[PDB]
Amino acid sequence: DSRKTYTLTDYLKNTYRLKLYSLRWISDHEYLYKQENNILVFNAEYGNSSVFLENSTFDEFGHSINDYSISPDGQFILLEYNYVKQWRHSYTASYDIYDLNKRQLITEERIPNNTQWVTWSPVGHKLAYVWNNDIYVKIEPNLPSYRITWTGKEDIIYNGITDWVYEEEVFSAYSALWWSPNGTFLAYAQFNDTEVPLIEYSFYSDESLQYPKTVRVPYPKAGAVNPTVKFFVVNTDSLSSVTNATSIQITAPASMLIGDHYLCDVTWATQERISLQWLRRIQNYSVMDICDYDESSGRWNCLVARQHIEMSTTGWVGRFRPSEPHFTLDGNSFYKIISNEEGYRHICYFQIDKKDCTFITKGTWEVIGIEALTSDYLYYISNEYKGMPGGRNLYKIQLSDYTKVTCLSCELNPERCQYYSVSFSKEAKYYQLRCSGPGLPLYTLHSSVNDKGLRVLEDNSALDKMLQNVQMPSKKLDFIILNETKFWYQMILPPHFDKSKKYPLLLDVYAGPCSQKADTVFRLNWATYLASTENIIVASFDGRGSGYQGDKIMHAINRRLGTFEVEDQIEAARQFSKMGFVDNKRIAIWGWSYGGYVTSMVLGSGSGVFKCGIAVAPVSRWEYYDSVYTERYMGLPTPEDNLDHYRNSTVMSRAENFKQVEYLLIHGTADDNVHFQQSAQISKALVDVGVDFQAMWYTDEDHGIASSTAHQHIYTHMSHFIKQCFSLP
Amino acid sequence: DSRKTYTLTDYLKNTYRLKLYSLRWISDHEYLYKQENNILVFNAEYGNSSVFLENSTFDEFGHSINDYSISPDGQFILLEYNYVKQWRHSYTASYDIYDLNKRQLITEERIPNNTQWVTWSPVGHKLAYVWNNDIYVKIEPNLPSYRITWTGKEDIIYNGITDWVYEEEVFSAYSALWWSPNGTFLAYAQFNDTEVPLIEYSFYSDESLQYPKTVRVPYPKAGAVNPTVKFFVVNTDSLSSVTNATSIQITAPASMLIGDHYLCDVTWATQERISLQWLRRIQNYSVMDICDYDESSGRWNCLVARQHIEMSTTGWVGRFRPSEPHFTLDGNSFYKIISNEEGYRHICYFQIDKKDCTFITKGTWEVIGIEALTSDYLYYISNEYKGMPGGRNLYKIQLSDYTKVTCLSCELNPERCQYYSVSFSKEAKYYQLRCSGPGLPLYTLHSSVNDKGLRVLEDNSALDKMLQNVQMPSKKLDFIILNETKFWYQMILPPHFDKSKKYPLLLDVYAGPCSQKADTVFRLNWATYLASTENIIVASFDGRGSGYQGDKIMHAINRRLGTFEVEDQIEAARQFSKMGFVDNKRIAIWGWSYGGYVTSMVLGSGSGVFKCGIAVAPVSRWEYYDSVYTERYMGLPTPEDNLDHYRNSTVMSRAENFKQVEYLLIHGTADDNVHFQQSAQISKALVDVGVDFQAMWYTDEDHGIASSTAHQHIYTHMSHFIKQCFSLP
Amino acid sequence: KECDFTPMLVGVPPQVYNFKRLVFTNCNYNLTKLLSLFMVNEFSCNGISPDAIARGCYSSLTVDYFAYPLSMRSYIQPGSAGDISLYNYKQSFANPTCRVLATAPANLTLTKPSAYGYFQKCSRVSGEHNSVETPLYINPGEYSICRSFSPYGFSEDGEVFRRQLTQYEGGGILVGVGAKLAMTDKLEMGFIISVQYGTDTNSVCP
Amino acid sequence: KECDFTPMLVGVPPQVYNFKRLVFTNCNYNLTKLLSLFMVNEFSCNGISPDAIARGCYSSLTVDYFAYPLSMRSYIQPGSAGDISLYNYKQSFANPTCRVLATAPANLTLTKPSAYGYFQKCSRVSGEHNSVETPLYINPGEYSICRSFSPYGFSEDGEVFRRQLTQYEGGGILVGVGAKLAMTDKLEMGFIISVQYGTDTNSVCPML
Ligand SMILES: *[C@@H]1O[C@H](CO)[C@@H](O[C@@H]2O[C@H](CO)[C@@H](O[C@@H]3O[C@H](CO)[C@@H](O)[C@H](O)[C@@H]3O)[C@H](O)[C@H]2NC(C)=O)[C@H](O)[C@H]1NC(C)=O
Ligand SMILES: *[C@@H]1O[C@H](CO)[C@@H](O[C@@H]2O[C@H](CO)[C@@H](O)[C@H](O)[C@H]2NC(C)=O)[C@H](O)[C@H]1NC(C)=O
Ligand SMILES: *[C@@H]1O[C@H](CO)[C@@H](O[C@@H]2O[C@H](CO)[C@@H](O)[C@H](O)[C@H]2NC(C)=O)[C@H](O)[C@H]1NC(C)=O
Ligand SMILES: *[C@@H]1O[C@H](CO)[C@@H](O)[C@H](O)[C@H]1NC(C)=O
Ligand SMILES: *[C@@H]1O[C@H](CO)[C@@H](O)[C@H](O)[C@H]1NC(C)=O
Ligand SMILES: *[C@@H]1O[C@H](CO)[C@@H](O)[C@H](O)[C@H]1NC(C)=O
Ligand SMILES: *[C@@H]1O[C@H](CO)[C@@H](O)[C@H](O)[C@H]1NC(C)=O
Ligand SMILES: *[C@@H]1O[C@H](CO)[C@@H](O)[C@H](O)[C@H]1NC(C)=O
């Protein structure tokens, strides 16, 4: 156009809101959606909606309901209020149970305050909640709680809940509870943090607080004492109101009891069969156990003939952890995603008693995940369409043929949609397809029987009418060939991009192991503003170590974090600037977390290509980060393993080379992930050398710096730094 | 013209250094002086010298001698090595003792490592050291030590040493030991920190440390529980090597035991008479006790009829604490500096059992300190000459006729020397005069019998020759009138200063209670470089709250800190701008500690006078600072005292007004004085209101940021902030 | 003359993996006496009648006894799978054998151990990556190599024992997990009576 | 009837500032029988003979007894200064009196207290801004106004006691400081025997 542009206020105040359609399947043909603060039910076949629960029915509760959970039988709703956040997924709150058909709030034997977790059984209206690191179970929402565990100790023993390193780098969740399908068994893990050292930092809180507060969390850094894990399964049907409950412990396989290990995956198969994945501390060896319930002794028996070893000799196991199994309806076979000897992750069909599997999928591409398993079909997401690793499409394969694969999403709108997310219903009767880009998000509803796109849920045409009178930037996704291998880049170009004029280049970088910054997803981000308003070329590059391109590219950074993936961004800038439309004297680089570590290593690399750079909460020394993440790619910091490279990779080593670049160092004082210690050691090295730089701390902010006021401040501050460094009025 | 300017690298690398003449009087006619690392003894009357200790007699130790202390009889020298700084005056080190007579190192019964404090007796070679918070006494340097106390407990009980609040705000020293004049008695204080809350902060240390340390210091904030104090005296001659030593307790007067109180001064009068000064927690009421020893029982005796009461109705007692007494030879009378009925501090003459005292000096000026007392003359320093409160001169007054006062330093070199300090010999036969400015420092030696100048000890003519190559700035010390009252200011004028040309002005500020930033002291500082090289006028101003001018100007900010001292700095900058050599569009303000508080309160006032400002380790909320200092001027932060003024005077309340200025906030992480909490709450208030600002943290730096690398980094960072705000190349 | 039936009914009974064995030759037995001393709940024999074994002439009469919970009776049966038969006790069927699972009367001068205990796992972890888990099963009538780890019970359910295997057993390291079962109102025993013939005119008679 | 001295021999004896006072009328005594029960270390009389004290007919007989360490025997001497004479006990010489410093062997049935204790300071605070400190000394043979502060020993040395006074008690704030003395091997006591005579009513004659 020749009018309005995407400004910094549009991104900070969310002027152009993207509509979403988030539904919760209740059955095989009825789903729940919230509109006008009214919880409704949409019959998948007719589309006819109905009022499930309205808005004014809670205008007398006197509390701010933060979330809600409806039991799988629809007879109760779990109301959550007094939400208080902890880490990325953990939080405690207060709960109440409102009966639906009786329309009365249950008042007997209420859920106690400060409840750490609560979950329904997958079928029915049974409840299990964690409180004071101890598990409780209510067979019915109006009867007294049954106490399962008695060893709950704060920061020491965890029952049914995860510690820090398991919540963040293993399970990606706070819950360590696992119901059996039909509600009979409740499998729970136990974590022991006795000899795990504690990270300590200050929380200053509100002005009213006279003395600051010291936060102490068990945090296993690189090479420190990791926690230990036990596994238990309890029968939730034979609870006794006069005797304590009894838990049966499942021991890790003998190949895991000889050293440090992790419980990394729990997956129920039948209703008397459960699969546990274990991973050694050196995460190059994992073995999966399969355990059946023994009615005679009441125990659980796992046979060695049912063990499946998933190891690797050039790297680790899995993308971030070994994949989960998808069993058949009888529990004698399953499907998992593993490398295919050439390095590409495809689906393998396993027999629970035969250690060898047969790959039902092959090619120079990767399966992203397994979404549904029917008696006839097996649906999966992949990046196979047009050979682009940055795309996602839904696929269908026949259980009998293995050669009749059908692109269920590709070419439904190929000019607008190349990134898909599917949400199946119960029994995989229907499914919702979520298109994330390159166009506006598109929500479609289908029917798995004959692929009948019956309804369109959200076309986001309301956001389209607004974006016509603004000068939106374009998004190019292409590739380059270095060392005879194809590496992908992506660029956000200013509107009315002239191919001959020189442009400022901001190199956005994460470059983490198994990362992907070049995709087809549509975003209204800070890069949108820098390209639309400031006319800056925002570019990313997936190099050695980026995922979804075979284990050949991904494992290039094994035991060498801070070498290849850093030089990729450097030499790419040589390739970027040589394209002719880039000001080879105004090239910046900015990153967060691992990306901040890369930006720091690049600015101190003496490459002479980058002018300035910003690093937000960066890693500085791998011995400062946690053990599960770091040791997966770095091993152990001992003079026998990879300590020599542990010391050869710190940002502080490159202190004297920061005399040639402008440097903006940002870090939140309450960061539980990348502790402030990391940035404090960077500044201490730059000061002791004689390097001037800009610094900015954010009081009581975490790894996200995502508080409403702090998020606007950090992006306003980085905008000033970029505009000054590029000499842009 | 073609000369060089005083650069930032000259100030940072100490290119031009002031020579001093530090002497230690060992007698009435001899003093010690180190020259070329040789310790020389000089004869005052004649000037001949001899070598006392050679610059090579300690070269075979392998140690680096950090400091030394020769015993008063000259028989032993205490060597201090392995120095580790704690707070402002406290530290820890090891101690070798060298027998000067036997020319060998004392190796029997060595002083233990981690010794907290060592002190000789004032005569002889007795030693008292504190180790593990317990006091030990050595009669001879190579004999076993007697243990005086057994209650020493880290962070709980302090014997012979001070805690943080007593070291910082009461005694200004780590030592809590007070020998008797001839070494017979050892008087010490005991501090109990049982219920004192702890300030906690992280210390990151060197890069090799994997987990940060958490420093815990007993630190009483405003209104918090204060430490308790006890006083004891022990006879160092009756020390048996088979029975525990006995310490006699001197209790505080009954008017102090009724509530919380402090011990603020210890002064020995005779060999059997000691004078203690106690102070209530409400620091407008102090009591002086006089205690005599009797060898009949062995205990002490403080007559009630010998107590003295110094109280204030306009504010607190003394400048920071009550002044110390100066007793006559018999110890039955003393001279003390107290405030008169007009609020001016002059010398009163007390009889130990006569409640009324006689003022021997009067006028609209103040006595700074009593320096010597003979049987006929009393020597003191005052700001009377030419009515300048920023000057210092030595006066003597006849005790037979108080009308006979004589100035010994007014007319010596009145254009070069206006700020004097004196060092008298024993029995006051000679005195060294120390001139501080406004010219280069000048050190002379005189005799008291005829006030005859003996010789010039140091004239700094070596530096003078060097300083003529460089264009040095000048200094103007004048006054302006506000509400019919003279208020003094000083200005560092650039070389070749032009009354017709306009200059940018930087306001240097502290503005604390009883402060004085306008004086005649010669200083080679950052302001010298900013004036010589950047042609910036650097001004300071002593408004309401400043000392040495009467209690009406000083006790004006009583119970209302952050009010008139902030307004008067702004009023001074207004009056400076009406002058025709100040660009009223390029005015800045910077400060440290209280000056940071004033700078921040000024920048958030909305006056629109200042363009930018720098706050280094500022106080932000008076409930965050320690109790002794804060409650002295503000009171108890209680609804029944002055909590309303406690909350009306925060920097956080003025956050919105920072949108008008460019603000730079600097603070060290390891600040035990003004905790990083204070700047953490300022930056949080600026972020939650939309104010952009520049920041800088210094890892593991204290309230001084005085490490060589850090001190150079902050003054280089602050220089660029000013040169960009003043639009300087 | 009189066979010493006494060692079975004095002290604390051993565990399943730590079973004691009484071998009898040249004596006279009263088998109908010892069965009455207990509350017998199973008298299973193979190759001989339960009544015929109380009245016969044998060369050797061996008896293996141990503490065995009645709830685990499914795992002491012939050809049974489970941790009992694999890593603890497997009955030998080379000669006529009888199997008696009996509970003892309240006062039989026999002490109830803290709890019942059997081994859950007893494998040899070896290989070039310590990746081949080789479970070590027992031969009938033999002792498990994991017996030495804790031969008198376990401190609690799940105790992981570790030691190195010598070159005699080859391989790498032996790991063994134990299991604990609570003690019931009374203690429950278990006996395997084996009898042999041979043409040595026999010797063991009623 | 006979004057019994049981409270001097049973129970735990009080401190010097809380001395118990027995007064005997219309009874008979055996003074030498009680001194045999102790190992006396001092028996100084004033106004009466150390022998005639045991043989005289008296109008009344009063005894002040308390726990007292032998290490502080100089502070109880006649005319002595110090904390004992000022804030604890001062012997009265209005009547003939004897002073006894005795050690009780384990043969007796009285128990050792936790420690010895006297008062270091007992003063009154009043006036403008609570500025007037008037030290409260005792008349001979009287109790300190600080006795009610701790009537069963001091918990620690240097214990500070403060409490508002009534108008009958003078007024102001009463401030007191206690001193604690370590307990000896045996029990050491202090007895102050005084004698009052009457014109014709001497009915506390001795036992024969
Ligand atoms: C979580 O793990 C800790 C250890 O990391 C467990 O605490 C340990 O408990 C055992 C059992 O008493 C103790 O170890 C040993 O105790 C004996 C005394 O019986 C002692 O002599 C040995 O030297 C050894 O310490 C000990 O109390 C303790 N060990 C520690 C803390 O290092 C704890 O039981 C575990 N929690 C669970 C499994 O729920
Ligand atoms: C330091 O002060 C504390 C607090 O007054 C003293 O501890 C007290 O000691 C007695 C013991 O019964 C009681 O007054 C309190 O119960 C104690 N308080 C606490 C907090 O423990 C301690 O004795 C003092 N130490 C010294 C050496 O004087
Ligand atoms: C010290 O200052 C305090 C507070 O400024 C004053 O104490 C006041 O004393 C009067 C009379 O005793 C009371 O009526 C007031 O309530 C007190 N003020 C407060 C805030 O409580 C007094 O000027 C000084 N006190 C002394 C002992 O000198
Ligand atoms: C929607 O369809 C379902 C189908 O079972 C029906 O039960 C419900 O009553 C319908 N609601 C409306 C509003 O038509
Ligand atoms: C499923 O639920 C039924 C309840 O009727 C229960 O009997 C059965 O054991 C469950 N199935 C399992 C545990 O496999
Ligand atoms: C100065 O000379 C006199 C002359 O005898 C001598 O006694 C004295 O020790 C000398 N002083 C010094 C410090 O050399
Ligand atoms: C053997 O035991 C039986 C038990 O019923 C008894 O009747 C019989 O007399 C016993 N015979 C012996 C001890 O010889
Ligand atoms: C008094 O006591 C003495 C003890 O020495 C005894 O000899 C005497 O008989 C007693 N007199 C009496 C009990 O009357």
TrEMBL record, chain C:
Glycosylation sites: 30, 107
The protein's name in its UniProt record: Spike glycoprotein
Species assigned in the record: Pangolin coronavirus HKU4/P251T/pangolin/2018
Span covered, complete protein: 389 to 594 of 1358
Superkingdom field: Viruses
S-S pairs: 3-27, 45-98, 57-205, 122-146
